[PDB]
Amino acid sequence: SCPSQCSCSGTDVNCDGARFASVPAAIPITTQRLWLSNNQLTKLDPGVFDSLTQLTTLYLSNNQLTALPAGVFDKLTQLKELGLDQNQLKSIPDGAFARLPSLTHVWLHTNPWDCQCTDILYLSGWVAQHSSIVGEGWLRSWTVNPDNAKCSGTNTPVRAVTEASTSPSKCP
Ligand SMILES: CC(=O)N[C@@H]1[C@@H](O)[C@H](O[C@@H]2O[C@H](CO)[C@H](O)[C@H](OS(=O)(=O)O)[C@H]2O)[C@@H](CO)O[C@H]1O
Ligand SMILES: O=C(O)CCCC[C@@H]1SC[C@@H]2NC(=O)N[C@@H]21
Sign of the CA dihedral with 137 first, then 160, 154, and 44 last: positive
CB of 33 shorter than 6 A to ligand 2? no
User: How far is ligand 2, taken at its centre, from the CA of residue 6, in Å?
Assistant: 27
The closest of 28, 33, 30, 1 to 16, measured between CA atoms, is 33
How far is the centre of ligand 2, averaged over its atoms, from the C-alpha of 136 (Å)? 6
CA distance linking residue 99 with residue 23, whole number of Å: 22
Going by CA atoms, what residue is nearest to atom 16 of ligand 1? 61
Could you tell me if 20 and 39 are in contact, meaning their C-beta atoms sit under 8 angstroms apart?
yes
At a CB cut-off of 8 Å and minimum separation 6, what does 138 contact? none
Alpha helices of the chain — where are they, by DSSP H? 121-129
What is the spatial distance between Cα 100 and Cα 141, in angstroms, rounded to a whole number?
Answer: 24
Handedness of CA 29, 14, 141, 150 (dihedral sign): negative
Torsion of CA 6, 16, 128, 92, to 10 degrees: -70
Instruction: State in Å: Cα 87 to ligand 2 middle.
Output: 14
- Residue 147 CA: nearest ligand 2 atom is 14
Cβ(73)–Cβ(95) under 8 Å? Answer: no
C-alpha angle 69-70-71 in degrees, rounded to nearest 5: 110
Q: How far apart are CA 32 and CA 80, in angstroms?
A: 10
Distance CA 17, CA 172 (A): 31
